[model samples]
Target chain A: SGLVPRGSHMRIALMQHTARPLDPQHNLDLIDDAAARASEQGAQLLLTPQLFGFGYVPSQICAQVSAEQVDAARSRLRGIARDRGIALVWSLPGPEGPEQRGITAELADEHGEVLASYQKVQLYGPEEKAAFVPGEQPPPVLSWGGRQLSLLVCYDVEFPEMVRAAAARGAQLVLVPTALAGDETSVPGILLPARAVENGITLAYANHCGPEGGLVFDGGSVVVGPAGQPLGELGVEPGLLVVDLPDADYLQDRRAELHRNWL
Target chain B: SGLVPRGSHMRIALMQHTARPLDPQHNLDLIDDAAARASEQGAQLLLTPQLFGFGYVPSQICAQVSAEQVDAARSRLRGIARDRGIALVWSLPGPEGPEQRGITAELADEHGEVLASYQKVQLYGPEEKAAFVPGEQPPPVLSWGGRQLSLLVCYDVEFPEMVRAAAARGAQLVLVPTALAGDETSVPGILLPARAVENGITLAYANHCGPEGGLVFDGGSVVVGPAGQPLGELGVEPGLLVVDLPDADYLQDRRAELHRNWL
Candidate 1:
């Protein structure tokens, strides 16, 4: 684990659990409790799974909750982060239009102010593709604890270029709220670590455990260092993974070195 | 364990051993023997580590070998591949000019003809940077069997975009002749598998083990399939790893999906 007390390190936590489908109250309560525990362990930031506000029921999301309710629920989650004295990364169905929604991940400072928001660009499966409009913009990179930080959601982290783009823009830490279901291990165990190592940035992946909305979540949430080693990881269980992300000043390469020239 | 007989597959072997420093005769003989056993195991291709003709004595390479000797050694490698009835991927000091040599990888078909060649794009540490010219072109994507293939050198495979570029150009398998030394397992263990899974391509990392010249080789060469699982791997020993790479028809994404837009 990278939890060693060091100078200039960001301590973050990933809360891994399946929030009850269509139950915003129960979901937010669970996050509130998790954030309390995470903050007690000195985690400055906590990452929850995708669609953490209500649940990961993408197909039935629109029918279950109105945009007004979604906004109120997000505000509560922000307050939860502020009260716990920890910054938080959470996801919800963001309204793209009056009727259309996009899978959006948002970052809130410890003061409960939204710093940046990113929409899922690589929509996965029939339910997500049909229910959500894909985001056209790249993830926003900002400074967090002397390190550049970025955010991604679920299937977006599966692609190599997504994380590279973040690293291309001087991102030192990237976090994701994933929804990996049908029990595949490569996303958390291999791809996440690989992306972190190649890009030379710390990456956190948070996911749900157990069954939700007819999908069996893989539940292997993890935080990996720039050295391609997991700081901490959860294996198919409801738990919390809190670890320190050390700096990768030793691994920074020039922008040109990070890019592949196309023929 | 992908050696299962399938309708479409490519069986390849990775030769993992430190060659004699600047000794082409002994090196070629070892590969000649390796290709024989690899071909007997139904391998159609054998991939050797970087600078297979001589050794990984980057500091002394140019001082010890001439362009003429390098060409002759490369020719001998091709002859060995042809005689073994197996295609080979090998590395040598390619002539960039009369005095300039670039670390280059070439693909030799079973007929003893060069199908394609790739120069090392990322010229590793100070030794390589000072001794050789970095490759200006991306890895050439060519067809081998039912799949599009490409090649990379040691440091070249560490960048995420290197593999992405090959995948963007429709490459299904990538072979690298790496010279990983000073003992690190993350390259072959995490990054290579991550590249294969994210790009949805088969990747073979051929690396040296034990001591060579003044450097200590880590000797953890491996072949990983598209699912981010190693088909076969070697410990810190001189050995042969024959693996059959299974197909990944199910993981294909569009060219647009493989790229991240810069902001």
Candidate 2:
């Protein structure tokens, strides 16, 4: 038996926008606006781009932010989710940790209750590896809205192994907060839906748009269904996308169990 | 330490065609013709669709293929590859094996020496599950033309795990033999390139065209590079696609060793 009930539709809202680097207050203000808009559109969950609350910038900026500041921002985000009555997935830089400080993705319910959290695994390049510690644990999946949900930040979702690990744990939806800098089509056009189809799970990729810290973020976000079909997508401009999720039967009925056995 | 040398070019050819059910002689004739065409086009490797020698009909047909017939057919295919001076990847029903009889993909060098053989690991549905036993071993990889190459059958290539396994073994190019039914775009258009890009490997998918039994095969074969670029592709008709492989530096330079830690 799967976690997602048959024929259930959960509206997902993707917030694709440009973040003002190092401006936590301004970023939170934008989240506040997006959350209200998404809630008005009746989205069950709202997903923000990676480090949107602090703007996509150098990891040292996050390191410079005191623990009190990080806690205050987390409380503010939780308040936004609670006030909007929509579950939220947000990525934030971790405070000092055991190994090295890392980026953590957190999911909170409409009531502001934390559902699950995942550290960013598979750090992107030398910059990320040097600035943050890599996550040792696989992504954690939890029950939400009659579906199994998990979190992966940016480069983590780009690797099939990371998503496959989530799928093996019966994740029906993998929400991603990405800060990508490239031609728009490469990841969203080519990799996003394929990740959904290959693993037989819904995937919501929320990415940044515009420039931050000398990097241009191409704002192409997408929600892909179990059959690898695009439900809703965004172009290279800041926008909001809300789309109903497809059924989970496609995950079970399409392919035989032989595929999952090895995964 | 990459397998593909810089400034080196290797032309790969995908042989997409309709197969006559259970007619080895007729299929060999088609392969001979395709090999000639591909060789003239300067393709060093020719990839044929799964079970092209015996149209993708049913399990009973493959069961009926005697071991002697299978051996004779393999010899003929090797001879064809040697004569054309092009490496070839071919798929056929397994001769009697320890596990349930299944599909086996074989790669032969231009000189006709067998490079690798891989049994289909993930069967599609009940018809395939009941008829064939799935493979337990990981796909085998071998060196060819200063490149690391591997093989996977139709449905096997659809699974990311199988391809990831190949990439972990340092496979630079994966030759797939697929017999897909439905609109052409989903697998070849979306999934194939994603598989190539995610693993940083070149993938050549050769699919059948026209009808075999009641199933209509969509012949949109493709060759994808490491960066998810389409080197060459085909439409709905049967044809040969010859394209040069991209450099392997994209694999090493794009990401750091942290990403490959699990692999």
Candidate 3:
């Protein structure tokens, strides 16, 4: 079946896949397969979880990998972005250089071009800091479906800046590809919409499902509206869930009138 | 005394005062009294609940009044903002071209210039939609204390876009002025920190205290870090709750290292 109907609105899908910890190749394959399904379902964008190509393992596994390995994954992601003909969003660990280390949230378009990249500014715990290097850029927006799009990864969804940076970048849609845990459901239920309402932008949370190592992924993936409203679920099932957003004209009208107070 | 002690971080206090609904003079006096107390404690900025000047009574009264009357109250707010040398935040009912109405969130500088404003986009129920015009603009950053600030009013805090809009506008701090019922405590307890975490910015909720119009106002104002991590006061109590935030350098450092993902 076609992923999207002809002459329809901008629709997106999020895949909640289980990944094998520290197995980059298998994880990468999983992502590719999901993208294929999403493409077949007609999703303009396909989002996964943080460290998706590489599972969200502890510092020990992260330290075992070389910077070149990280670069190699980026290359693979670039290829997938082009081959899929859709925007692919995910996250991975990176070298901290001199400033220290953390995860990086990245995105690429159908052409396999690096659309945007941001370092995780709010590291959750000591273990995460030990293996990752954070990025310096604020939220960056990508042009998608005649709308501005923003990206945030995992723990980034918990912070106000991640969503704000995207909205500040004029993103109508804030895509969050998270490797969240069981306890993080609060982020999707309360915080996700809070970010949507307070910033007046739509928010999407694409997270991994099941347990990885000692960590459990909570797949409460959601999409929010500019009025801090949640759009219908991209369904909660384990497969590719597709949904089309309403037109931007409503958002534009709101911006010109009622939302003027915050400006 | 300075808002912060010498060689100490700034002590920012958020005030949540419940205004008497259907009584403008009483509500105004109540805010005046609260502001006086906040200034005595050397608070740099004092925020109140949404519609603090007149309380959150839906449009029956709002529709009966003329725009000129609302403007007069706004002018009074300007005077308070200047005379106190304290930046003030509050909201009022606004006319939406005779068809719609909204709760207008306003930020005034110490000099009494209207720095920013945003209307409530997510009308909590039929009452709000019936009375106040809903806002439409994306959040924008307001400058204060060498920091970029933003606003989220009442129900706006419940959604992610409210905070995202401000953070996306490059706001480092988001001030939420809310007037919630006593039953809303649990929601705010989880929601406020989530707003901070998802957007990756400092978030503060200033709520109304006491009862108004037979409804008891719930006081659960709080502040959280970039990771939706609570810095202090998850629940609200009477009196002024103050927290000395770490410098932007400290916050920036945290943002730069691991887990730094803003949406």
Better of 1 and 3 by DockQ: 1
Q: Across residues B30-97, which tens digit of lDDT does each residue of candidate 3 receive? A: 66666667667777677777777776666555556566666777787778778877778777766344
Q: What are the lDDT figures for the candidates, one per model?
A: 0.81, 0.79, 0.68
Question: Which has the greatest lDDT?
Answer: 1
Better of 1 and 2 by lDDT: 1
Give the lDDT ranking, best first: 1, 2, 3
Q: Assess the local accuracy of residue A134 in candidate 1 as a C-alpha lDDT between 0 and 100.
A: 81
Candidate 3 residue-pair clash tally: 82
Ranking by TM-score: 1, 2, 3
Write the residue-wise lDDT of candidate 1 on A64-159 in tens digits.
678888888988988997899889999998955426879899999999999999988888877777888888777789998788889988887777
lDDT of 1: 0.81
TM-scores vs. true structure, each candidate: 0.89, 0.88, 0.56
Q: Which prediction has more favorable DockQ, 1 or 2?
A: 1
Candidate 3 local Cα displacement, residue A46, angstroms: 1.1
Give the runs in model 1 whose Cα sits over 4 Å from its true position.
A1-10, A244-263, B1-10, B40-42, B245-260
State the DockQ, from 0 to 1, for candidate 3: 0.16
